[PDB]
Structures are given as C-alpha cells and as structure tokens.
Amino acid sequence: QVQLQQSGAELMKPGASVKISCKATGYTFSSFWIEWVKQRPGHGLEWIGEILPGSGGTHYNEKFKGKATFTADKSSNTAYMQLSSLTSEDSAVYYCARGHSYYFYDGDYWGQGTSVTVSSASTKGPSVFPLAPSSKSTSGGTAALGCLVKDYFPEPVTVSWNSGALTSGVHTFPAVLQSSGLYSLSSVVTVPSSSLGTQTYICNVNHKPSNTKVDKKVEPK
C-alpha cells in the first residue's frame, strides 16, 4: 500500500522561507503527480498546484506561482514544496496528495498534513496542570478528570491518556488563542467514580515545535 509521510509541523519567521517534505511510498514515484493543497484554520481547501516527479514538470495555481515552488528527489522518492517570503496568510496546514498518473487515476491518496505558522515569535512549550476529579459526586454518578495544557506556541500540540492505554471517553478540545498570544486547550476523561482512588491516569502532552514531552499525574480531593 501507498503512503505519504510529510515532514513535521513547523514555525518560521515572516519574510523567511519553509520547505515541506513529502516522502512517497508503495508506488512508482515518477508516474503520478504529487499535489499540494493549503488549508488555513477553519477555511476549507485550496489547490496549490502539482508536479510530475518523472519529467519534473509543474502546474502552479497562479495564485501560488512564485509563492510555492515544488521540487522532487527521485533517488529517495521525496517531493518537496518551498513556501517562501512567508507572511500571515501562509499560516495553514499543507498537504501533499498523490494525484493521477496520465495512465490510471485510482483516486487521491493524502499525506497527514504539515502544520505551518508564520511568526516573529519564539516557540514555547506548555505548562500542563491537572484537573483532578473533586466533589463532582454531587447528584452525579461518574467522575471527570483531565489536564489543562496552558500557554504554548506554535499550534501543533497532542495529548494522550495513560499512554494510549485507557483512552476511551476522552475529550481533547481544540486550542483557543488567548490574549497572551499563546494557545491553551484542555483534555478531560469520563470514568467510573468507583475506580477513583485505585486506578490512576496520566495525560501525555506532546508539543514538538519545542521538543516538550510531558507525562503528568492527576490526583483528586
């Protein structure tokens, strides 16, 4: 089967440039076009253009011509996209999809997406606090506990409970842009009040742009 491992999410400065990788797998790389679409926070999808690694030929979306520039390395079956002269408008999630071959178009296979933020800012790991299950027994039944991932930047942060183990009944809300300019988000879990004092859980917050890796502990009242 086919794959498309895109480089990781990143942060860059206005006026600077950024290069996104796209490692294609499970197919003859030069036969199919590699496509790039952009997706700014809550705004749909934009077709950036494409490139045929075999011939090196490219069809840019005029709106992106000059802004995005594609390249590709046959040696390693890796396609690239260089977004240069970055500005606020370029902060978005970019994807590379396996287009069609001018032979057989069995659809579009997509990469996971690479997050990109343009900012004269500095990355900053988060501070995770515990939201322990307190007197939430009043006319209730089950218990709610979770972690607060406070003030971090840029936008790509992931949370896991009990290391992927007991991750059922988990709610990880999307981040909210606070006054400080940092992001914050909360992650909670619904669980059997009974098992609240024996079995314990921990959230695993990861914020790559700063190489953070917190595995925190939550303890009730």
């Binding site: 077709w47 606090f129 009944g169 909210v176």
Partner: protein, 211 residues
Amino acid sequence: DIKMTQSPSSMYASLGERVTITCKASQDINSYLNWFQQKPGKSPKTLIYRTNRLVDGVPSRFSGSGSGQDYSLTISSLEYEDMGIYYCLQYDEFPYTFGSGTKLEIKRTVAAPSVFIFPPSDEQLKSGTASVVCLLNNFYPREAKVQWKVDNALQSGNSQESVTEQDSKDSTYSLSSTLTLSKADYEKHKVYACEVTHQGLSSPVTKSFNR
C-alpha cells in the same frame, strides 16, 4: 476559474437515514470530479474519483452520481463513521478547484449536559494566574449556553469556550469554558459559578465551588 458550489453548507441526518449532498460547477466539467471527506483533526481522504468510481477501501453505501455541471454524493445508510466535511473537486481544468464543503452531522435525541467544575490547580497557582474550567459533557444539541459568575457578577470577556465535534460513541458534543484571572484577583472573590442553560435542562443548572 470554475466555481464549485456545495449546498447546503450544513447537513444533518440520523444513523440509517439515506443522506445526499450535491455540487454545482459552471460548465461541463465532464464528470472529472472527486469527493473528499475530512473527518475532524484529520487530513482529507479520497472517497470517489471521476464522478462515480469509488476509491477502494470505501464502503458501498457511498455512490457517485452526477454529470455536466451537476453532481451529488449519496450515502445509502448513515453510520457514525461518516460525520465530517465533504468537498468536491474539478480536475477538468486548471486550476483545479474545491467546493465550499458541506459539513455532515448526525441528528439525534436531545440530551442534557453533565456540568463539572474544576478549581484552580495547585501548580498553576504556585505560578502567576489561576483559571477555572467548567465541563459540559456528552450533550445534544451543541446549540447550548454557558455563563460565568464569580460572586454573582456575570463575567464578560474574561472566559473562553471551545466545542468538540460529535463524539462518535453517542454523537454527542462537549464544551469547556475557561474563566481566567490572576492569583490575586482570584483571591479577592469567594465563589465561582458556571450556569448552564440547554434545551435538555428544564432549568439552568449551576455548578460552582465556594473555594
């Protein structure tokens, strides 16, 4: 160039109902159209290419219909796994273009929210500020309301809410509202209330600590 229209923008159906979306072009895009599905927090996924051919790995209830400048995507029986945003794309001409996208949410029976309140954590306080979170878990519809009230003084521009997509387990929503203040201003006051009005609650439920 070509304008790919999708409407409605929001679409609801119940699990089992037969749902169907449509997309309008601006010229015979000659059936050179695809349908994408982007579940939340996930990159898109190709479902149907060239108007009706199903990408493999895709269930059969999905069918490709349409031609000329009018196309649509139908789902014979709706299972929880199809909630999300559906997009259409025309590769009949450069530049390829996407439709606005129709969000597809599952319609269900009402369900009042369970309101949980969390007082400022120890660490966060051992720091500068202190923020209170209030949870509105597994409820429906999301079209619900929350108001902050420290000492019976309804807050204003000091909180922040966030909602999740329908948690497939029961197609319910979840919301969290955070009231944020310094350690100092957090000490001045005594109570922290979180009033929750929702069509499922025959009356505003209020969760709060006297901490």
